[PDB]
Design a protein around this ligand. Structure first.
Ligand SMILES: Nc1ncnc2c1ncn2[C@@H]1O[C@H](COP(=O)(O)OP(=O)(O)O)[C@@H](O)[C@H]1O
Ligand SMILES: Nc1ncnc2c1ncn2[C@@H]1O[C@H](COP(=O)(O)OP(=O)(O)O)[C@@H](O)[C@H]1O
Ligand SMILES: Nc1ncnc2c1ncn2[C@@H]1O[C@H](COP(=O)(O)OP(=O)(O)O)[C@@H](O)[C@H]1O
Ligand code: BEF
Ligand code: BEF
Ligand code: BEF
Ligand SMILES: [Mg+2]
Ligand SMILES: [Mg+2]
Ligand SMILES: [Mg+2]
Ligand SMILES: [Zn+2]
Ligand SMILES: [Zn+2]
Ligand SMILES: [Zn+2]
Ligand SMILES: [Zn+2]
Lengths: 359, 27, 333, 334, 362, 365
DNA sequence: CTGGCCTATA
DNA sequence: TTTTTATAGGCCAG
């Protein structure tokens, strides 16, 4: 699997995420090493891949280095998966306290193979109230030979009393190019045909996550019987469109009858609850209407959709917008009574596209 | 505003009317 | 009772340790750093046995009779820590405390962690008899005004040099969450040995994580700062607050505004602020609001606030957050 | 809980069917409040948990009724709402549906009394369905509401309906004049506010309540001519709001009835207020306001936990807006 | 051993079931074609034969005679189903036992072959009540049960079931019972019970049933009580708050004449006679309907109305089609929102008011 | 027996549509490029559960790892009969809790008995607690060589994004009306069963995308029609009346002809058609018309028998006019509930039409 | 197998 | 100084 094989073994192999690497690089380099680090951010952006790396760099036979060699008994042992002193707890399956207490009875004994006993607790947000307490008591009096590496997607769930005991690195989600350049590299290496604009399409679709990315790519290879072609990539991503709701709003304003009748028909295939489609649209117009009252009303949230949203606010009369809303908000109240529910959305969009309510 | 147009109001029957015939007729 | 700011504490704790250490406040990062500043200087003065206890109304009269028994000499010095209920010292435990105020050795070191106490809780005999022995730290977070100062102060303690420009940017991003701020600084000193933290450098290694209360939002509306309001909302959602709580706290204000607006015609501004016992600090801020919003705009707000409530508790609508994004904007024209 | 004299007939007829043995197992009595439905039920309950009955009456002296006098009869279940709450939860119905299967703990029949089916939850209503359609043997159900049509569809077809209709007003006034010393006008008004049920009438007089209508009246007297209705917030915003609103709506309607020169008004006791309302409010607005008054009332009563102050405050500002000339007024929906 | 007719008369053989002939057809048809499913969902409004039928479909699958469409009712099996004592129709009160753990027990005891019966037949009734989770639990089993298992699903409100659940059933919407259907039955039942009845009284009951056989039997039983043994046109009509024709029309009239004082006072007189308010509205709605109908073709006024016809025709000639529609709607709406208004009376009074001031156009 | 079950496809060949899914998996199998987490989504009955099973069945075919499993080796036949020791189908809707998931976790490490792979197909997977989702996380990210994970669910919406970034996601599309029909034909043919052509066109429409829904309707159609799947039988069961009568009412209405309208209603009333239904076919028709006006290639395939006439209507009657009739019948539906009598109610609604009729209103005094 | 606690959905 | 409710599913320590 692409996602597995292309896990970064050397810092050099890691994409972006530089504000994290560097500070680690340098702390190792310049003898600064906290008893415990926390790595957060979104699915598949480096959290654990880096956590593993910090272990390599902490125990490398060449010494505590920012640039682990990835060729010593230790680096290949870790890279392999079985290193005496690399304890990577799957916090998500072993969360009850019994198991955390038993993990930390052995914390005291000296490390067999290497410089540090490195505990790498991954998906750590899952540990119980009590289990956190156990950890805590060990973090408040950390054995010298021990270092803790906490990685979670959702940090907000750790107690203040533990986030206050970790140096926390929030990994940023990856940049569209950042993902693309990495996708080129890997396909290139694996010896696989690709087009320019095929990859531009996958990096976008990843929505910032390098794993989503290779997982998407893996699939893409199969759709392409060995070639990652735009012809194929675009088809596949069309299989998985969230789109519809925004996409309809767009073709709604422009007044594109076919595009509308077609999206409605695409949405059909996705297999959508129709009432829910209206609601997403309505929500969509709401947001927009308000981007028309400050640039500030667009989310940290949004991002993926965001480009499209802003343009749409720029190029539609705010008075036109409240109008579209009315028409949709209405068609919703009518949905149960329209013959079909599909039919009721279709009718609502005609109403919105072409007609005007006189009152 | 006709008296009919008024009655339609009282009845909840909302009157719809064109506004962009352009994207209709023409396919 | 030596009253301290957590920064100042480190120096006062070295001069001479004292029988009672009182860690009062709301901020988590000031609490740990102050609690750990003491645990550190306690072990150094020969203290090994460190005993922690969390005080609920749950702790029996059997769990406070193992605590007063806890100190018998001669024991190698032991540090007892006592955690608080939300309410602070209740009548049940305001009395348990008394029992401990007299048991004060150089062998036993008292530490106490909790919120701020109501003044009468504070002046309860036992507290003021501890007084001359005890050191007390204020761990109230800084607000938008007091903050940047505390940033540049802790900045110069980590001997890094912060730009007026970068201070502004840290304070936006970590307001209300000192711990993330601190770790931000640590993170930056590791990024750059330089110590020099440019606006453009600092900008790149920051993530947006401010913690607000709903009160931060009504205040925001009251003054008309909307880019703030919107920020506060977005953040409040992400910490997952119950919107109901927003609704009700905006209301307590919105409806006072309405009643004030009318009454304003008849009597002078100040008289009405007095009439309704409006907190002093708020009163300036309220004026501003009053002066900005029409008796009709208020009428609309009230109406729109009702639209969302009903939409919330009858229509089980999703909308709710959007409906507030709007309501916010409205109260800013 | 009191026993009122207009129950004797409704009781005797009902008991008769039971006494045949041919009574229906799920009775649903519909009655206004104050109408004393509960006492009819209690009376029928005592009748059933009677091992040695004396005609229509309960003895007092059998092991059965002693227990019933002293609250705790093992086979007598009461579905009312928890103390603090105003709904009637499923879990509580399920205990009763469960216990009902155990052979009667005293070896008499088992009677389950749902004080107000109006208050059953959706889950709680349905829970009751199957036990109600066909309950174990010698089990008898009693249910009471104001308005059967507000009651779950299916729950309804499993019941026999009995309408406890209120006595002729003439009688009612005469009843009242004995229980209180009020002006014939007042009685008839009180009685009329309360959809004709004496006692429910009487209530208004008993509680702090009546003084409190005079204060709605006091404050209305001012709001009308002054166009200041947010003034009313004081008199309306209270726990009993849906009740006080109803008062305000009846005042509004009497006005509207005068604009038509109608014969009966409801608030016979203050025809001054009724007038000043017909005078400074056009029918158009009289009626549009009557509308929102009633509607906000529903919500105050039907939305669980909704904020009173916020709703009533809206209603009042919005009414003032209606008072503005040319504003668009509401017209009911669907 | 007394049980309400609505209980005693529960159809015990396919023969003794009223209407729903399309359901029974498909059913008996399937049994006889050997085409038996594993998931039968039965829907329709209150008291039309849902659970009754389900239980009959159970009998037929289990009958000692064989798998039949026409189950005897005379074997240890049928008699035990009639009495619930039948070990192998596990009948679940879904609205009471809704939780997952509850229905996961159900699932674990499926795999087990049936006791003394041929099929193990679950009958989840009031099924729209199973938790979200409980539905999903059944998905995998409901789709692929053991050959010895049959699932019977009845509910009033199939709207609520997951479409994943629906995708896995044969669904049979029972139609509401025709007015006639209900009466013929009602007649029959009172005959067999040896109770005296007047035909027109039956007519009123079937109407008031509003589609529903249980509703009917329940009002019937109510009839018998307040009638002192007899179900008489007199007693039933007084019970159901039935109108004497004059009163409704008079209102309708005073309403279009815009005559406030008289609409209001007319109601007052109605209220005294203790009329069912919802009744009044429906009857006016009925009158407004003819009126708009007669306008279309003069002939459309029935042989029934002879007494009124005179007053009807005028109303039709005078008042615009258009304007009547307003009147009808305003009253319909008012019937809708009736139980929600403070008094039922008031609800009516407000409805007439709103409609009152329609009269002068401009 | 039961069609829904009897026809669950046994090879890729037998899977309807979903080319985009079948085509990847086969391409990938023959390509040797195989993931360890496959996720399947789509509305009920579009083939996910059965596709997933085919994948397991093809992963473990004694002939080799092939997209064309042989259906005759001990491994294929025993997967067919659901008793294959190494395809562990977990009903995630009853094994939802964590402890349950942990048990599935513990027993992963152990090697398969008789197959190339231990394949866990976790069906109805959206039901797992939050807790048992993250439980799955790491073990799904990096499993052992011999382990494969087949997840499948109606809505993937409910699975944490962490789970999502770890799988191939295959979204089965709902089915064309044509597709459903063709299968319904094949099956009724194979099962030797009389059928009217149009009765299939009718079922596949009512299936609303779902090949199961369709087979479920057919099953009961066969029973309703007595071993025959006849048009009368399908439209009986469906509440449909065969299209003419519906339209004829629209027509009569736009044509402002009252007599005909009421007659046509009377005649429908003789057939005791259920009133709401009628109203709805009318809204159905108006809507398709109003649509035909938008795009012309929009008019439905199924209503050939009426296209001539429909087209005409869309051509002759003003859009703003149809918006009238639609809305009028629509709030008419909103009303039927409370109208005195459902017939009356429909009638009355069309009388309302007539009086506000845009082109020849009803006569005034 | 209880009582403390968190969550989602309508 | 921070709040709707009724009903369900659920994790967890001892
Ligand atoms: N920064 C990165 N550089 C290179 N590959 C990455 C990066 N982030 C994620 N990936 C890809 O995702 C896979 C898993 O990433 P991982 O670090 O486990 O994410 P997480 O933070 O969510 O645990 C890696 O094997 C790699 O293919
Ligand atoms: N189709 C019918 N034929 C005969 N009796 C019926 C019919 N439908 C309902 N009933 C009467 O209604 C009572 C309950 O019917 P039931 O089938 O339980 O309704 P449900 O569908 O609401 O569960 C029975 O006692 C029976 O007398
Ligand atoms: N793509 C398809 N091709 C053929 N039959 C299908 C297809 N999808 C569903 N079916 C029919 O529906 C039945 C169940 O299909 P299934 O795959 O379980 O749907 P789901 O995706 O919801 O689990 C099968 O027995 C089969 O007859
Ligand atoms: F492994 Be990551 F947190 F998606
Ligand atoms: F009253 Be039934 F079961 F719908
Ligand atoms: F029936 Be499928 F799995 F939704
Ligand atoms: Mg990870
Ligand atoms: Mg039933
Ligand atoms: Mg499936
Ligand atoms: Zn190395
Ligand atoms: Zn007795
Ligand atoms: Zn038999
Ligand atoms: Zn094979």
């Amino acid at each position: 699997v692409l996602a597995r094989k292309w896990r970064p073994q050397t810092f050099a192999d890691v994409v972006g995420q530089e504000h994290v690497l560097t500070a680690l690089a340098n702390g190792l380099s310049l003898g600064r090493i906290h008893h415990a680090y926390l790595f957060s951010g979104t699915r598949g952006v480096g959290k654990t891949s880096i956590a593993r790396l910090l272990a390599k760099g902490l125990n490398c036979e060449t010494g505590i280095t920012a640039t682990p060699c990835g060729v010593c008994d230790n680096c290949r042992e870790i890279e392999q998966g079985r290193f005496v002193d690399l304890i990577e707890i799957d916090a998500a399956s072993r969360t009850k306290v019994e198991d955390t207490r038993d993990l930390l009875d052995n914390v005291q004994y000296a490390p067999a193979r290497g410089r540090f006993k490195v505990y790498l607790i991954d998906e750590v947000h899952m540990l119980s109230r009590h289990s956190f307490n156990a950890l805590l008591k060990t973090l408040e009096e950390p054995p010298e030979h021990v270092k803790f590496l906490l990685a979670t997607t959702d940090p907000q769930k750790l107690p203040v009393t533990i986030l206050s005991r970790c140096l926390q690195f929030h990994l940023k989600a990856l940049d569209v190019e950042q993902i693309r350049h990495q996708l080129e590299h890997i396909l290139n290496e694996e010896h696989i045909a690709h087009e320019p604009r095929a990859l531009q399409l996958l990096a976008r679709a990843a929505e910032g996550s390098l794993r989503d990315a290779l997982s998407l790519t893996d699939q893409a290879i199969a759709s392409g019987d060995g070639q990652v072609s735009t012809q194929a990539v675009s088809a596949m991503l069309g299989t998985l469109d969230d789109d519809q709701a925004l996409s309809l709003v767009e073709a709604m304003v422009e007044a594109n009858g076919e595009r509308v009748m077609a999206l409605i028909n695409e949405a059909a295939a996705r297999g959508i609850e129709w009432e829910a489609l209206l609601v997403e649209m309505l929500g969509l117009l709401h947001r927009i209407a308000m981007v028309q009252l400050s640039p500030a009303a667009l989310g940290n949230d949004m991002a993926a959709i965001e480009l499209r949203m802003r343009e749409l606010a720029r190029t539609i009369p705010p008075t036109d917008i409240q109008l579209y809303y009315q028409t949709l908000l209405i068609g919703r109240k009518e949905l149960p009574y329209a013959p079909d529910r599909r039919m009721g959305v279709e009718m609502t969009l005609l109403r919105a596209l072409a007609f005007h309510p006189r009152m | 505003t006709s008296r009919r147009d008024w009655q339609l109001q009282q009845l909840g029957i909302t009157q719809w009317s064109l506004r962009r015939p352009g994207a209709l007729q023409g396919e | 009772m030596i009253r301290l700011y957590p920064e100042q504490l480190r120096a006062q704790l070295n001069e001479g340790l004292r029988a009672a250490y009182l860690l009062l406040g709301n901020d988590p990062l000031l609490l740990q750093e102050s609690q750990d500043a003491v645990r550190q200087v306690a072990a150094a003065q020969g203290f090994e046995e460190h005993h922690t206890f969390s005080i609920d109304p749950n702790t029996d009269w059997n769990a406070i009779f193992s605590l007063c028994q806890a100190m018998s000499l001669f024991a190698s010095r032991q540090t007892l820590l006592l955690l608080l209920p939300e309410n602070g010292p209740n009548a049940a435990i305001n009395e348990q405390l008394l029992t401990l105020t007299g048991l004060l050795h150089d062998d036993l070191l008292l530490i106490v962690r909790g919120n701020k106490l109501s003044k009468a809780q504070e002046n309860a005999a036992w507290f003021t008899a501890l007084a001359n022995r005890s050191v007390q730290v204020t761990c109230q977070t800084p607000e938008q005004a007091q903050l940047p100062r505390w940033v540049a102060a802790r900045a110069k303690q980590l001997n890094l040099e912060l730009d007026d420009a970068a201070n502004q940017v840290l304070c936006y991003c970590y307001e209300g969450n000192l711990l993330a701020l601190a770790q931000a600084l640590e993170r930056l000193s590791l990024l750059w040995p330089d110590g020099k933290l440019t606006l453009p450098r600092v900008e790149q290694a920051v993530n947006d994580a401010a913690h607000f209360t709903p009160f931060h939002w009504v205040d925001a509306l009251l003054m008309g700062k909307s880019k703030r309001a919107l920020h506060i909302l977005q953040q409040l959602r992400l910490e997952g607050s119950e919107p109901v709580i927003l609704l009700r706290t905006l209301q307590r204000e919105l409806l006072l505004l309405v009643n004030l607006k009318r009454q304003s015609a008849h009597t002078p501004l100040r008289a009405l602020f007095d009439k309704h016992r409006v907190w002093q600090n708020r009163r300036g801020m309220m004026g501003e609001a009053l002066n900005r919003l029409s008796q009709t705009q208020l009428r609309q707000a009230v109406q729109l606030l009702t639209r969302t409530e009903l939409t919330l508790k009858q229509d089980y609508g999703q909308s709710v957050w959007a409906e507030l994004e709007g309501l916010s904007l409205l109260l800013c024209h | 809980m009191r026993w009122y004299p207009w129950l004797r007939p409704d009781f005797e007829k009902l008991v008769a069917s039971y006494q045949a043995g041919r009574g229906h197992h799920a009775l649903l009595i519909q009655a206004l409040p104050g109408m004393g439905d509960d006492a009819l039920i209690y009376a029928l309950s005592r009748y059933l948990l009677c091992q040695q009955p004396q005609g229509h009456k309960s003895c007092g002296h059998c092991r059965g009724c002693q227990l019933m006098q002293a609250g705790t009869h093992p086979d007598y279940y009461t579905l009312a709402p928890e103390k603090g709450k105003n709904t009637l939860g499923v879990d509580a119905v399920r205990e009763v549906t469960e216990k009902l299967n155990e052979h009667a703990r005293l070896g008499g029949a088992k009677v389950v009394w749902v004080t107000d089916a109006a208050l059953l939850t959706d889950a709680a209503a349905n829970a009751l369905l199957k036990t109600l359609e066909e309950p174990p043997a010698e089990t008898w159900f009693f249910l009471a509401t104001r308005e059967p049509e507000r009651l779950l569809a299916t729950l309804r077809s499993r019941c026999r309906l009995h309408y406890l209709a209120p006595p002729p007003e003439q009688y009612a006034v005469t009843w009242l004049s004995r229980e209180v010393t009020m002006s014939q006008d007042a009685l008839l008004a009180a009685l009329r506010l309360s959809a004709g049920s004496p006692g429910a009438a009487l209530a208004l007089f008993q509680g702090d309540n009546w003084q409190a209508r005079e204060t709605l009246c006091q404050a209305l007297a001012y709001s009308v001519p002054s166009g200041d209705w947010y003034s009313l917030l004081a008199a309306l915003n209270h726990e009993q709001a849906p009740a006080r609103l109803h008062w305000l709506a009846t005042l509004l309607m009497d006005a509207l009835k005068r604009h038509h020169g109608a014969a009966q008004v409801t608030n016979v006791d203050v025809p001054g207020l009724v007038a000043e309302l017909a005078n400074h409010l056009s029918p158009s607005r009289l009626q549009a306001i009557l509308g929102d008054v009633c509607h906000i009332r529903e919500q105050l009563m039907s939305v669980t936990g909704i904020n009173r102050e916020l709703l009533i405050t809206d209603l009042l500002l919005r009414i003032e807006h209606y008072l503005q000339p040319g504003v668009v007024l509401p017209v009911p929906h669907l």
